[PDB]
Amino acid sequence: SHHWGYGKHNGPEHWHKDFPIAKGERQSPVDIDTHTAKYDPSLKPLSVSYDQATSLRILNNGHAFNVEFDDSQDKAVLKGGPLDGTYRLIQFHFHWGSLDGQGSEHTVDKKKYAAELHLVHWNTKYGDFGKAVQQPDGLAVLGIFLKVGSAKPGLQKVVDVLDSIKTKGKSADFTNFDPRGLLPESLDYWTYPGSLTTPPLLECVTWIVLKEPISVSSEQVLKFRKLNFNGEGEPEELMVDNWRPAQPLKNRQIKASFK
């Protein structure tokens, strides 16, 4: 079994030993250079259809927390944009920092945001998530930056349950959560082909990164930082700085949906 994390001894600089694709040709995240990204007038508009989303549970996995969805049918889907076909929402999670000046995985002109939300979806043409991750177009991850300012009302239900999943392996019922409350106003985005940003680092992702951050309050992000990477009864290691830094762009083009 693998023992990866974000520390000096098990962090991103170590991952390539168990997961050699860490040094691959389409790794994520990347820096988005806004003056190199090209507007692609042929991208179709992005369609986020989350009205029938059914959340189930929230889990501390020792790396982040995952809000899990019922993906047994096309409840909540992502379509359009760069995507061919239908991608089903399976879960969301975040990456965040120890301080407000870092925490995002993607960067924008080298700017780091306080956190980044990932809504993970799988291409329904492959039948299940495990099959989808073996395909170069198997996943679509919708990434949304967080900055500290005003509170995000749609985030508070998440914040308030974190006390009940402090440590690795803890979970709580998390039904009736509406992920529409986590979106910014604009769906303007950048897109490029990449990977999972955690082990196993599979090169199966179409990334769609929204240009507009959401604002969350300092109190909200402070509560993220009270989580623990460790298990119950173990010495406290605060769950902070669970982000991978930018990786080499290599042959890839980042496209913009907007001028």
Give the residue numbers annotated as catalytic, written as ranges: 63
Choose between 57 and 217: whose C-beta lies nearer to ligand LMS: 57
**Nearest distance, CB of residue 259 and ligand LMS, angstroms:** 28
Annotated binding-site residue? 198: yes
Backbone angles phi, psi at 22, to 5 degrees: -50, -30
Query: Residues 137-176: x/- map of binding to ligand LMS (CB under 6 A)?
Result: ----x-----------------------------------
Binding residues among 104-123 for ligand LMS as defined by CB under 6 A: 118, 120
Is 214 one of the binding residues for Na ion (CB under 5 A)? yes
Q: Taking the mean position of all CA atoms in its chain, how far away is CA 6? A: 16
Annotated binding-site residue? 93: yes
Is 244 one of the binding residues for Zn ion (CB under 5 A)? no
Is 78 one of the binding residues for Na ion (CB under 5 A)? no
Annotated binding-site residue? 2: no
Q: Regarding beta strands 214-216 and 139-148, do their DSSP bridges make them parallel or antiparallel, or are they unpaired?
A: parallel
Is 184 one of the binding residues for Na ion (CB under 5 A)? yes
C-alpha R_g of the chain = 17
**Nearest distance, CB of residue 115 and Zn ion, angstroms:** 11
**Which of ligand LMS, Na ion, Zn ion, none interacts with 79 (beta carbon under 5 to 8 A by kind)?**
none
**Nearest distance, CB of residue 142 and Zn ion, angstroms:** 11
Binding residues among 193-232 for ligand LMS as defined by CB under 6 A: 196-198, 200
Query: Residues 92-121: x/- map of binding to Zn ion (CB under 5 A)?
Result: --------------------------x---
**Which of ligand LMS, Zn ion, Na ion, none interacts with 214 (beta carbon under 5 to 8 A by kind)?**
Na ion
Choose between 147 and 166: whose C-beta lies nearer to Na ion: 147
**Nearest distance, CB of residue 39 and ligand LMS, angstroms:** 25
- Please give the Cα distance from 164 to 155 (Å, whole number): 16
- Annotated binding site for substrate, which residues? 197-198
- Annotated binding site for Zn(2+), which residues? 93, 95, 118
